[PDB]
Homo-oligomer: 100 residues x 4
């Protein structure tokens, strides 16, 4: 790959923003705050694609705890996470899950 | 501390089984099947490889939240410590488990 | 190319790497890694295989007892053998292997 | 809290310094190229490894590093290294203990 795959756990800093590509593919962006314990927080901008993007826009909001795995990138400088998988954390919440 | 931390993504093979220790700490166990896939260029199709199975255990509040939220067949993402134990075999000591939103939505409720 | 379980393991070689070749003549080196948590705890043992140039570099550079860091893909193979014995092996398909500098130095020569 | 693995080449020779207590600490910058844009991370390793690094590694060399991803100050992302290895992808190594 040359890709840097990582996992991050934290809380959304903001509600997800849903956009679309020219082909009509959904893309949702949101910032995650990961806090080591409180030490200084790691903030990462995440983007989620396709169906997951819509499930995220609908299901998630500021303050919710997530676990995300994706590919770490740097843009020209901001560091970003291209998310491959996103889950609503069950650490301190329950979920009623509905298959799309 | 020299622990081997890994992230696994897949479907629950069975309903989580919830038990308690003598001190009263909740513990939920369940098996995750993670299926790799490769694109077959000649047939123009994604073909599935052999599934990776791991027995997971989650502790305390998370354990009860799992017993309440997850069922057989649901997709999850888990991060935790890879262990093998007594013959030896593998097990994941879960530090964090999430219900995947890849192809589902969720109503989330704190605590 | 999808749904793979990528992991990093750190530990010592249990044995000298075993160098073999595929029918096409590609090198492949197998070695088992022993990862021991300090929390000494029970060690995690994982069979690794590395390919091509790295495999040769490994056979040449590493031996039993040396400390490595490896990143690769965790796979499961389950089968019934010619004698009716049902078995399963887990294996780390290595993408990157490094000689650890935690308690060693190294003279590094590019191939 | 956020442990990651990164693979790449040293942008520069490692810089060895010491703290008031005499603890060694080595800093180097890794470039990880997916060619697309490169991910650049400043790495620091402590103690014996810091010294082994200063003696073993130089700019251009390929490494694999595992450690804790941190952010500071605008801001920059740093890797607090728990483990660093000289990659054998396109190199051989003569390895010596301690």
């Amino acid at each position: 790959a040359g890709e840097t795959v990582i996992t991050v756990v934290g809380n959304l800093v903001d509600d997800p923003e849903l956009r679309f590509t020219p082909s009509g593919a959904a893309v949702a962006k949101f910032r995650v705050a990961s806090t080591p314990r409180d030490g200084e927080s790691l903030f990462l901008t995440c983007s989620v694609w396709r169906q997951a993007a819509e499930n995220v826009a609908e299901s998630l909001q500021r303050g919710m705890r997530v676990i995300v795995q994706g590919r770490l990138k740097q843009r020209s400088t901001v560091y970003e996470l291209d998310v491959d998988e996103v889950g609503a954390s069950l650490r301190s919440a329950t979920a009623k899950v509905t298959k799309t």
